[PDB]
Amino acid sequence: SRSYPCDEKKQNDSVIAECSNRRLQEVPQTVGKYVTELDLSDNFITHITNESFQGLQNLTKINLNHNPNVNGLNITDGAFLNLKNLRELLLEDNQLPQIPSGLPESLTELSLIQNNIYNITKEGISRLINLKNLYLAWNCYFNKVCEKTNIEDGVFETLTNLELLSLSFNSLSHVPPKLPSSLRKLFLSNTQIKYISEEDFKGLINLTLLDLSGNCPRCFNAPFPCVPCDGGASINIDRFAFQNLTQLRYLNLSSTSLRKINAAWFKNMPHLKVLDLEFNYLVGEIASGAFLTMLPRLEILDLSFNYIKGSYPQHINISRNFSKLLSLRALHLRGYVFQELREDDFQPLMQLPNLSTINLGINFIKQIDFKLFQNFSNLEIIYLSENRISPLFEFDPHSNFYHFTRPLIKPQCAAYGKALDLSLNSIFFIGPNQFENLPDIACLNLSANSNAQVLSGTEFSAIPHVKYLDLTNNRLDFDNASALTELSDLEVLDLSYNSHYFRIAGVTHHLEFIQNFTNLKVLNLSHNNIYTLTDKYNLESKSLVELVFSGNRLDILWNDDDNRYISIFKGLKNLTRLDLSLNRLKHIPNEAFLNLPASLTELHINDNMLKFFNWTLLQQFPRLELLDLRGNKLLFLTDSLSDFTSSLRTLLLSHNRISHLPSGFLSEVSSLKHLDLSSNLLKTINKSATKLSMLELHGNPFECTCDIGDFRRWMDEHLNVKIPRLVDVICASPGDQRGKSIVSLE
Amino acid sequence: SRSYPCDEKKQVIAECSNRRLQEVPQTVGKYVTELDLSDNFITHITNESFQGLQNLTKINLNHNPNVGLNITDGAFLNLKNLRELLLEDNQLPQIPSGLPESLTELSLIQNNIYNITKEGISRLINLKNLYLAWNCYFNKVCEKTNIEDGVFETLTNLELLSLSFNSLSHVPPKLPSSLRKLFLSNTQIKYISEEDFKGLINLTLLDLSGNCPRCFNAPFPCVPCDGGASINIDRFAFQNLTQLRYLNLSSTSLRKINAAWFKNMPHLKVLDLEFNYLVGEIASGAFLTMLPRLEILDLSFNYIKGSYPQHINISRNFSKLLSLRALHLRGYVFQELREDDFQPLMQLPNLSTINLGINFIKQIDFKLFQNFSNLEIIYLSENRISPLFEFDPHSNFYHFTRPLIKPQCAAYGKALDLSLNSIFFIGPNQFENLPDIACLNLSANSNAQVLSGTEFSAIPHVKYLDLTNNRLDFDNASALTELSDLEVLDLSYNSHYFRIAGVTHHLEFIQNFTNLKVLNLSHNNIYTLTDKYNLESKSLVELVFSGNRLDILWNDDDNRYISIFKGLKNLTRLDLSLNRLKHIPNEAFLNLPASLTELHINDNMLKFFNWTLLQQFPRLELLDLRGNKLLFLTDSLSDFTSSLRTLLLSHNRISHLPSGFLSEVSSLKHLDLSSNLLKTINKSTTKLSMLELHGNPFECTCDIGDFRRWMDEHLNVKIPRLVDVICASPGDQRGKSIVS
Numbered sequence A: 001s002r003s004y005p006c007d008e009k010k011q012n013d014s015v016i017a018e019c020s021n022r023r024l025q026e027v028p029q030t031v032g033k034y035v036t037e038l039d040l041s042d043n044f045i046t047h048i049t050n051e052s053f054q055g056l057q058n059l060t061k062i063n064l065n066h067n068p069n070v071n072g073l074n075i076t077d078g079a080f081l082n083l084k085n086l087r088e089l090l091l092e093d094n095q096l097p098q099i100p101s102g103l104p105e106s107l108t109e110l111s112l113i114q115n116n117i118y119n120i121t122k123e124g125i126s127r128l129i130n131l132k133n134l135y136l137a138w139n140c141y142f143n144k145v146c147e148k149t150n151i152e153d154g155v156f157e158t159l160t161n162l163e164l165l166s167l168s169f170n171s172l173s174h175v176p177p178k179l180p181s182s183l184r185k186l187f188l189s190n191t192q193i194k195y196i197s198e199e200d201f202k203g204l205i206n207l208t209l210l211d212l213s214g215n216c217p218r219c220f221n222a223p224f225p226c227v228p229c230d231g232g233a234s235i236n237i238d239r240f241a242f243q244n245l246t247q248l249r250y251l252n253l254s255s256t257s258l259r260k261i262n263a264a265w266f267k268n269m270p271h272l273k274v275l276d277l278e279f280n281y282l283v284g285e286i287a288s289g290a291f292l293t294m295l296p297r298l299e300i301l302d303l304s305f306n307y308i309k310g311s312y313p314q315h316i317n318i319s320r321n322f323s324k325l326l327s328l329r330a331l332h333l334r335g336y337v338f339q340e341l342r343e344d345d346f347q348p349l350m351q352l353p354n355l356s357t358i359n360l361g362i363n364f365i366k367q368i369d370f371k372l373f374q375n376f377s378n379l380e381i382i383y384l385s386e387n388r389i390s391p392l393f394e395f396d397p398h399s400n401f402y403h404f405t406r407p408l409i410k411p412q413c414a415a416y417g418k419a420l421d422l423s424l425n426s427i428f429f430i431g432p433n434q435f436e437n438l439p440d441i442a443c444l445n446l447s448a449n450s451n452a453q454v455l456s457g458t459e460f461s462a463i464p465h466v467k468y469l470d471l472t473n474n475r476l477d478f479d480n481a482s483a484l485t486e487l488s489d490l491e492v493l494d495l496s497y498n499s500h501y502f503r504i505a506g507v508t509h510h511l512e513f514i515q516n517f518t519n520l521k522v523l524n525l526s527h528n529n530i531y532t533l534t535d536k537y538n539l540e541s542k543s544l545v546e547l548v549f550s551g552n553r554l555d556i557l558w559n560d561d562d563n564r565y566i567s568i569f570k571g572l573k574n575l576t577r578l579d580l581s582l583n584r585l586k587h588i589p590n591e592a593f594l595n596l597p598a599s600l601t602e603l604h605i606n607d608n609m610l611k612f613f614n615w616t617l618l619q620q621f622p623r624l625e626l627l628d629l630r631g632n633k634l635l636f637l638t639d640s641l642s643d644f645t646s647s648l649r650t651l652l653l654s655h656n657r658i659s660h661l662p663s664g665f666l667s668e669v670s671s672l673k674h675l676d677l678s679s680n681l682l683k684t685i686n687k688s689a690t691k692l693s694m695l696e697l698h699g700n701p702f703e704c705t706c707d708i709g710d711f712r713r714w715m716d717e718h719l720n721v722k723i724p725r726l727v728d729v730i731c732a733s734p735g736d737q738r739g740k741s742i743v744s745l746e
Numbered sequence B: 001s002r003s004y005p006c007d008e009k010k011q012v013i014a015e016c017s018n019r020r021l022q023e024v025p026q027t028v029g030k031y032v033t034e035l036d037l038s039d040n041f042i043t044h045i046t047n048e049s050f051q052g053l054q055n056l057t058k059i060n061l062n063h064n065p066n067v068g069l070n071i072t073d074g075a076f077l078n079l080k081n082l083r084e085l086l087l088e089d090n091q092l093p094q095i096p097s098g099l100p101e102s103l104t105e106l107s108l109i110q111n112n113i114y115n116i117t118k119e120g121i122s123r124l125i126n127l128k129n130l131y132l133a134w135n136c137y138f139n140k141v142c143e144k145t146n147i148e149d150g151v152f153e154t155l156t157n158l159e160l161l162s163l164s165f166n167s168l169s170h171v172p173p174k175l176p177s178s179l180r181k182l183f184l185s186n187t188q189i190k191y192i193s194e195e196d197f198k199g200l201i202n203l204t205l206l207d208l209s210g211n212c213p214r215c216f217n218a219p220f221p222c223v224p225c226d227g228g229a230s231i232n233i234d235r236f237a238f239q240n241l242t243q244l245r246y247l248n249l250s251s252t253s254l255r256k257i258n259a260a261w262f263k264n265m266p267h268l269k270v271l272d273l274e275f276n277y278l279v280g281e282i283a284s285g286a287f288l289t290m291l292p293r294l295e296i297l298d299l300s301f302n303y304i305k306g307s308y309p310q311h312i313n314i315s316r317n318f319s320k321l322l323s324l325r326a327l328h329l330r331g332y333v334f335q336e337l338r339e340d341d342f343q344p345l346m347q348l349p350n351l352s353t354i355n356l357g358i359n360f361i362k363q364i365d366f367k368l369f370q371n372f373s374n375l376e377i378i379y380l381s382e383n384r385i386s387p388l389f390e391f392d393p394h395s396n397f398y399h400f401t402r403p404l405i406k407p408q409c410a411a412y413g414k415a416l417d418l419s420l421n422s423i424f425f426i427g428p429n430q431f432e433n434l435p436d437i438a439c440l441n442l443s444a445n446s447n448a449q450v451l452s453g454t455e456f457s458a459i460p461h462v463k464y465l466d467l468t469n470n471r472l473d474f475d476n477a478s479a480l481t482e483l484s485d486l487e488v489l490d491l492s493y494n495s496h497y498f499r500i501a502g503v504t505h506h507l508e509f510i511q512n513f514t515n516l517k518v519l520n521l522s523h524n525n526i527y528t529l530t531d532k533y534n535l536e537s538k539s540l541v542e543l544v545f546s547g548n549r550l551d552i553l554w555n556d557d558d559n560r561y562i563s564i565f566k567g568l569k570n571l572t573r574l575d576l577s578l579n580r581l582k583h584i585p586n587e588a589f590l591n592l593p594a595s596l597t598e599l600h601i602n603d604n605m606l607k608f609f610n611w612t613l614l615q616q617f618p619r620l621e622l623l624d625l626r627g628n629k630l631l632f633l634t635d636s637l638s639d640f641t642s643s644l645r646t647l648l649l650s651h652n653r654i655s656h657l658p659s660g661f662l663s664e665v666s667s668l669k670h671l672d673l674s675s676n677l678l679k680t681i682n683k684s685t686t687k688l689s690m691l692e693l694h695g696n697p698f699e700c701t702c703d704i705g706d707f708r709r710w711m712d713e714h715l716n717v718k719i720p721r722l723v724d725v726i727c728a729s730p731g732d733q734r735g736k737s738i739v740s
């Protein structure tokens, strides 16, 4: 039949049963017997048993993370022992008190993150001689009630294929002895280890990663309960502790209260590539550090948040030895805290051939001598967000704890070239010299600078090749029709969240500049509360392909007593994508609709208040593939869609008030592959109501009398029409056979 | 049994509006006088409709049908002390024939009536107020309005006539001299002669606005007179309007104002001259000589297009406006205000409001405000100061009428409003030489400074400070403490720095204030503080903490914020709404102030609520738990409180009420259970005044009989919106109001 309650789907070619997040109270045994990998995460399962998977042994991989989704998960001894194929077991966030007993010797990956396991035992682990990755992090941390972690002596010795061990966010006090030398990655972050001896990593010649962050933490202003070493002292790492760590590429010493870095740590580390020294006390070492001479293959240096409490120095003080970091590509210096960036201050960085990212986020910087960036060899990313420049469980266990890892710049903007991010500063107006002597900036972010100026056509004269311009969340005054026109190569413009002046009827508003661009493809005017323009009422462009106009007031613009804005988007001759969501539309006048550009392939009018839609108007849009009408108040479909379109591929109608499907609504429009009727008021689906590929029906108040059998037997026949979330296609009616999926009835 | 579908009240109105009603409902009582059926689906009125209702003094059928109303020739005729009939927004193509002569008020606003006839109107000999406005305007498809000669002659008790937003072209002749108020705004009248206002000697208000409009940048379809010319008002046109108190000539394209216009208006009090071309008159202004009793003068939006002069130019003759209380000069547009510039206003004894909003002012010489006699409201919002149907037919069309300053702030004394400027940083001298400001608005100034306890030293008696929508860096434990008398502090929407984990955040200054009553910390994304984790005050009564991250502050692995509100020792109102809460750790709940009388935790994601903890809140009268995901009420509420008066549980997932009621909590007058998942109420006295139940999926089999009988019995237990307490089961009953 149609698989249930999981959604099968095949890949490499494995056969995954996505079965997560479904209010499942037990491993379903209708799981069906072809599945390898299954995912039962985020369900209400509270027991596991040798029964649970008793007829399923092609399973390479099981994910039971986050069960039950609030007791704990109760897993009996040997439960999994019969799965001889089982390579990957994920058991995160299950409130386990122990490593389950009698796990299969086949396991290569075992995750036990975010439980209550305080004992690491031979009996739990030592039989798992095929383990490559073992995750035991986040069992005892912060102000959780938990025990010190007891690691049986030698427990890791038999694991001679162990490559990744993670024990972070456990109370360990010492690095465990008897680590197998197969290890490539060892994570010991936040484990309350004060001291690293010579002996602790002696044998680990294969190690490429070592993480000792958060041992002797810097606790000032911590966003979590933080226990420093006595007197807030430094971690203590024996001079010889890394002497055989010859293969190390990654070394994380964040928040280890370091004031000094022992250059000898790096003697026998010729491959070190990433060094993380955030949240320490290294302003001295940054000015004067001899370790900078030991790292000719380093590519990423993170020295963020090394500020001294009570100091806002004039300038940043970079050692001349920075010039020896020949391989350096990214330098992170957020939160050093200083007032002013001078050209001379960064001289030591200027001849590094590969330095493409400089990160100065969050430094309370007031002035920058911008011309210094030109004198670098090869800067691609100049990141100055969140400064003071002016004119002119809460933590994800699978992510970096000490900073976000999202790119500094959106890839869509960075793709165009050199990027300068000055977002979240106080450049509240751009004077004639603001951008003098910058490199050829292609991507510029001026978001959240509370800019209130009248852009006039001259402000970006010195960086006239910007291709992607972010001016979101300012308060721009559009009084001048020449605004931004000096940017001939402009392709993407984001003017979102500039409501300030748009809201005021009494002031002028001029959007004429849009037409002057010959290369403009994407324009976002969202959340601007646009409701009146001055003189020219129409948006015009031969180029534009995408216009986002959500969060404006087309309800006023297209008011019944006003003809002025009736052709507002018609002049966008190239438009394929239009977004009119969140415009408080109760209806669209037929004439306004008919003046939407005939080029559209994609139209969103979701999250308005439409009670009626004139389906017949779709005749004037022969290219239209996607029509999105979700989150309105629509009552009525049409029985003759196929007269009105032969292009429509996707029709999205969730969150409306549709109670009937018309006979032959659907069956005639053979372009239509995806129909979404979820969260409507449908009691039933008549026989009459097949080129359809996906049909969504969840959250409709179905009647489960015998007149639903029409539908069921259809479902049975068209097994290649994906119906998602069958678990949420539920009977509201009658008393029985109620509450249960329509798919389980006689 | 129980009133339906209307809702009655004493002081006798039958609130029957907005109900999906398709016709007038027959079930309505003789005692009822005022029927309000506005916003319904009603499409037909006849003499049947109001058969036997008799006693109505007032009917409202505005907005019917809610996407024309067909009214028959004598429908209202029989009830003959009907004084007020309201028929707005009904797409009437005509005035209804055969209206009772009892009418003192008729409103036909927002219809399609283009013919005003004797046949319709002249019988209505008792009309005092007649509204015919907004029948033909803008780009509406409509006709010039035909006013049958002398139609208003017979109405000798007519006091108010409104014909605005109709194409008239001429003031109609033969108006009754009984008139007090004549509204002719936006009527396309180009010409006002001596003969139009005859006398009309009792007129107190005349509105000629929007005739010959100033159309530049108009927010509606605007048609000017030829070449954008001025309305033409004969020098003697108002010579017999001796009683006039209100004159509205906004948007009539005036470049000149004739002093003679005012010679015979010795009582003129409000003069509205907005959206004209009066910069020249403002500078030279001989008419200012003729208005010794004028109290409000609005000269807003008289800017010269494309002109941004250095200074504003105010005639010396403004010194003759001896009764002036409020002067509105928005939208003149000028760069700088200097002390000289306002000399002519400075000896005016009663000038309390000066409104300079929306002028793109870049600098003000602030000491000038001191030299005025007695300013109470100094309104400089929306400038560029830096560190030193769409229109409601019942409101003003040319400007908002809300107060300039919130009454709660202005009530403390002298007000200075500098909101929406660019005072991004307050320097030591910013507030020198100001008067004794009690109410200060600095909202939306992009302010990112670290307030330090010295910024308001020159105005140390501020009692109500609005710092909302800035980007304040809260990095100093002494911030704002120089304001000893401060009672109301609004810090909403200062997210910028709070949301950054790695910068420091300091809210300790709170405890310093001895008179602080109300503090608003809403929409700040507060989730981590530096060193001091607790909010403390002996004085504070109300804390708004909505739109922060208590979900994080009270995270299970963190004990630091577990007492965060405990030190607010005098707190009685607390708002914890919109904090993304799934559960509150019992210990965190028990540390809320025991002084609480009102607690809001609405619009979180609560799955569970520990009812027994209410034992520690003996003063608690309101508990608001709306918009969560709660499943289960307790059956022993009465063990956990004897104080609770209001319990709000709308929009949760409750599907069963336990016996007895929940309990019998004898203090409980108001229970809201609307929009839950309730199938039934079975058995099973109360002290409830009100039970809300609308929007639960009721089963309408014979088991719902239990509850009905209860309803029949406890008739003084108000159950609102019975139209919306409907069955979702079974099919045949489903749709219907349980009560039938």
Ligand SMILES: *[C@@H]1O[C@H](CO)[C@@H](O[C@@H]2O[C@H](CO)[C@@H](O[C@@H]3O[C@H](CO)[C@@H](O)[C@H](O[C@H]4O[C@H](CO)[C@@H](O)[C@H](O)[C@@H]4O)[C@@H]3O)[C@H](O)[C@H]2NC(C)=O)[C@H](O)[C@H]1NC(C)=O
Binding pocket: A168, A185, A189, A209, A211, A213, A250, A251, A252, A274, A276, A396, A397, A398, A399, A400, A401, A402, A403
């Ligand atoms: C100290 O420094 C080291 C850097 O050397 C840092 O090691 C990195 O840790 C993170 C885990 O915190 C690793 O990132 C993960 O890698 C795995 C395997 O490749 C991925 O599956 C993860 O991606 C999934 O989960 C992400 C987060 O939920 C999702 O965003 C994503 O879409 C996936 O579903 C994730 O990328 C990273 O591999 C290591 N680095 C190396 C080189 O091994 C360590 O975390 C730092 N210590 C602390 C406490 O911050």
Ligand SMILES: *[C@@H]1O[C@H](CO)[C@@H](O[C@@H]2O[C@H](CO)[C@@H](O[C@@H]3O[C@H](CO[C@H]4O[C@H](CO)[C@@H](O)[C@H](O)[C@@H]4O)[C@@H](O)[C@H](O)[C@@H]3O)[C@H](O)[C@H]2NC(C)=O)[C@H](O)[C@H]1NC(C)=O
Binding pocket: B164, B181, B185, B205, B207, B209, B246, B247, B248, B270, B272, B392, B393, B394, B395, B396, B397, B398, B399
């Ligand atoms: C020209 O200037 C004239 C004199 O200033 C303006 O005259 C005023 O006209 C207004 C608008 O009609 C009258 O408005 C008052 O407002 C209340 C509102 O009552 C109900 O409706 C509003 C809906 O907003 C609601 O807010 C309330 O709470 C009520 O539900 C009326 O009920 C009042 O009686 C009155 O209508 C003023 O009365 C009137 N002033 C005087 C002195 O009569 C005129 O509007 C200006 N012309 C234009 C086109 O703007």
Ligand SMILES: *[C@@H]1O[C@H](CO)[C@@H](O[C@@H]2O[C@H](CO)[C@@H](O[C@@H]3O[C@H](CO)[C@@H](O)[C@H](O)[C@@H]3O)[C@H](O)[C@H]2NC(C)=O)[C@H](O)[C@H]1NC(C)=O
Binding pocket: A385, A408, A409, A410, A413, A423, A424, A445, A446, A447, A448, A470
């Ligand atoms: C210009 O700078 C602004 C401000 O730094 C950048 O805004 C940031 O943009 C990222 C999105 O790429 C935001 O992260 C996202 O936030 C949303 C909201 O919860 C979340 O749903 C996404 O998954 C993601 O986490 C971040 O919120 C936002 N920051 C602020 C303060 O608004 C913007 O991207 C920059 N522009 C370019 C072109 O790089």
Ligand SMILES: *[C@@H]1O[C@H](CO)[C@@H](O[C@@H]2O[C@H](CO)[C@@H](O[C@@H]3O[C@H](CO)[C@@H](O)[C@H](O)[C@@H]3O)[C@H](O)[C@H]2NC(C)=O)[C@H](O)[C@H]1NC(C)=O
Binding pocket: A410, A412, A413, A472, A492, A494, A496, A522, A523, A524, A526, A546, A548
């Ligand atoms: C202003 O509107 C623009 C254009 O819609 C927004 O930028 C666009 O953001 C969407 C994400 O919502 C991007 O979609 C893409 O989706 C796929 C995966 O589903 C992925 O390949 C991409 O990484 C991206 O997520 C689209 O690329 C992006 N377009 C551009 C030109 O950047 C923008 O976010 C809106 N601004 C604000 C403040 O909302």
Ligand SMILES: *[C@@H]1O[C@H](CO)[C@@H](O[C@@H]2O[C@H](CO)[C@@H](O[C@@H]3O[C@H](CO)[C@@H](O)[C@H](O)[C@@H]3O)[C@H](O)[C@H]2NC(C)=O)[C@H](O)[C@H]1NC(C)=O
Binding pocket: B381, B402, B404, B405, B406, B409, B419, B420, B441, B442, B443, B444, B466
């Ligand atoms: C300080 O200045 C700010 C900005 O001028 C004032 O904010 C403004 O407050 C008004 C009046 O409360 C807001 O309008 C109101 O809006 C609600 C619904 O959104 C409506 O129910 C009311 O009828 C009313 O018109 C207005 O949005 C707001 N402006 C902005 C930009 O937020 C603030 O009240 C002033 N504070 C004091 C103490 O006077």
Ligand SMILES: *[C@@H]1O[C@H](CO)[C@@H](O[C@@H]2O[C@H](CO)[C@@H](O[C@@H]3O[C@H](CO)[C@@H](O)[C@H](O)[C@@H]3O)[C@H](O)[C@H]2NC(C)=O)[C@H](O)[C@H]1NC(C)=O
Binding pocket: B406, B408, B409, B468, B488, B490, B492, B518, B519, B520, B522, B542, B544
């Ligand atoms: C920040 O929080 C305070 C909330 O305490 C807000 O001011 C308060 O706003 C409420 C209305 O939500 C006011 O109550 C109302 O006042 C009048 C009584 O004159 C009445 O018409 C209403 O039924 C209601 O009682 C309360 O007076 C007012 N308190 C003060 C001190 O002004 C403020 O609006 C919030 N700020 C923001 C930006 O949301």
Ligand SMILES: CCCCc1nc2c(N)nc3ccccc3c2n1CC(C)(C)O
Binding pocket: A305, A307, A308, A309, A310, A311, A312, A334, A335, A336, A337, A362, A363, A364, B450, B473, B474, B475, B497, B502, B503, B504, B505
């Ligand atoms: C990277 C920031 C570390 C701590 C800190 N928070 C702030 C803050 N909120 N505002 C400032 C304003 C001016 C200068 C510094 C800060 C600041 N800092 C850095 C220190 C603790 C050195 O004041």
Ligand SMILES: CCCCc1nc2c(N)nc3ccccc3c2n1CC(C)(C)O
Binding pocket: A454, A477, A478, A479, A501, A506, A507, A508, A509, B217, B301, B303, B304, B305, B306, B307, B308, B331, B332, B333, B358, B359, B360
């Ligand atoms: C009361 C404003 C009338 C028309 C107008 N809109 C604006 C505007 N958006 N920005 C300005 C910035 C500096 C100076 C004037 C304006 C402005 N004005 C006034 C005119 C059209 C004369 O420029």
Ligand SMILES: *[C@@H]1O[C@H](CO)[C@@H](O)[C@H](O)[C@H]1NC(C)=O
Binding pocket: A326, A327, A328, A353, A354
């Ligand atoms: C610089 O980077 C490039 C990789 O793009 C590499 O080819 C070259 O070896 C690097 N040079 C140095 C000195 O590291």
Ligand SMILES: *[C@@H]1O[C@H](CO)[C@@H](O)[C@H](O)[C@H]1NC(C)=O
Binding pocket: A456, A457, A458, A479, A480, A481, A482
């Ligand atoms: C825009 O500003 C430019 C440069 O100041 C000015 O010369 C021009 O007249 C303004 N343009 C308009 C109003 O189109």
Ligand SMILES: *[C@@H]1O[C@H](CO)[C@@H](O)[C@H](O)[C@H]1NC(C)=O
Binding pocket: A518, A521, A542, A543, A544, A545, A574
């Ligand atoms: C229309 O858009 C396409 C796709 O971006 C673009 O290549 C083409 O040049 C555009 N046409 C015009 C007239 O700009």
Ligand SMILES: *[C@@H]1O[C@H](CO)[C@@H](O)[C@H](O)[C@H]1NC(C)=O
Binding pocket: A590, A614, A616, A617
């Ligand atoms: C929809 O548009 C059609 C065809 O253009 C028009 O004739 C018809 O009146 C409209 N239908 C509705 C319900 O408005």
Ligand SMILES: *[C@@H]1O[C@H](CO)[C@@H](O)[C@H](O)[C@H]1NC(C)=O
Binding pocket: B177, B198, B199, B200, B201, B239, B240
């Ligand atoms: C004012 O009008 C009355 C008629 O209502 C008239 O008697 C009187 O002469 C007029 N006063 C003048 C024109 O000054």
Ligand SMILES: *[C@@H]1O[C@H](CO)[C@@H](O)[C@H](O)[C@H]1NC(C)=O
Binding pocket: B322, B323, B324, B349, B350
């Ligand atoms: C000023 O206002 C007071 C209070 O209303 C009033 O009694 C007095 O007559 C006024 N003075 C003038 C010149 O109008």
Ligand SMILES: *[C@@H]1O[C@H](CO)[C@@H](O)[C@H](O)[C@H]1NC(C)=O
Binding pocket: B451, B452, B453, B475, B476, B477, B478
């Ligand atoms: C607050 O700010 C002022 C000025 O920086 C300073 O004198 C005072 O010491 C500050 N207090 C704290 C706690 O930083």
Ligand SMILES: *[C@@H]1O[C@H](CO)[C@@H](O)[C@H](O)[C@H]1NC(C)=O
Binding pocket: B514, B517, B538, B539, B540, B541, B570
């Ligand atoms: C507590 O609040 C009341 C009511 O506002 C106030 O009268 C009293 O002074 C406050 N107590 C303290 C200690 O501030």
